[PDB]
Amino acid sequence: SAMEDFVRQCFNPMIVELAEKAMKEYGEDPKIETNKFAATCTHLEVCFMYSDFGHRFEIIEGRDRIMAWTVVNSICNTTGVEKPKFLPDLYDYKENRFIEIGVTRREVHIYYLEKANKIKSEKTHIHIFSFTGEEMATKADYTLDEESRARIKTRLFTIRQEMASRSLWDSFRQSE
Numbered sequence: 001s002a003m004e005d006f007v008r009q010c011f012n013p014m015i016v017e018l019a020e021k022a023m024k025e026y027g028e029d030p031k032i033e034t035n036k037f038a039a040t041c042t043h044l045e046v047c048f049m050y051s052d053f054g055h056r057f058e059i060i061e062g063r064d065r066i067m068a069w070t071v072v073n074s075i076c077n078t079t080g081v082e083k084p085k086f087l088p089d090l091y092d093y094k095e096n097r098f099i100e101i102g103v104t105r106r107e108v109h110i111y112y113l114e115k116a117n118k119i120k121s122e123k124t125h126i127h128i129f130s131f132t133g134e135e136m137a138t139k140a141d142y143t144l145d146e147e148s149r150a151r152i153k154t155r156l157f158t159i160r161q162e163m164a165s166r167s168l169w170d171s172f173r174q175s176e
């Protein structure tokens, strides 16, 4: 498929392999669910980017469930922050809060409402990125400095334009 080929062209091997591991964790073939494959790669890369801005962040996303919950439990035991219902994506050691990262092909406010309604925790900070350079965060606290958020938004927009150059963006954006 063209979408699978794009995913292997634009993401680094480590990210692709982690994404395939996740797809198997919910029993999904990346050769069939190619838009989910690309979305999974994109979310992984954003989380790793977000974390590289420390030191400051602990990455939970990209780990197997056992190690992810091991990290979460160790953090909660050393900080007293309460355990989230659902696996978050990062832990911010400076603000001392868990962060759930969203990347959406829709309006940032719609996806923010969806994520907030799901997690149902006033403790887990939400930060939504779009492929159009838009962002929305809990209490409009964007956590990072503008340069770091700028590099995330540039990478996301670049992924979108590469898809578009291969006529893959319309499929990807209409998929959820």
Ligand SMILES: [Mn+2]
Pocket (backbone or CB within 6 Å): 061, 087, 088, 089
């Ligand atoms: Mn996650």
Ligand SMILES: [Mn+2]
Pocket (backbone or CB within 6 Å): 043, 089, 100, 101, 102
């Ligand atoms: Mn997320």
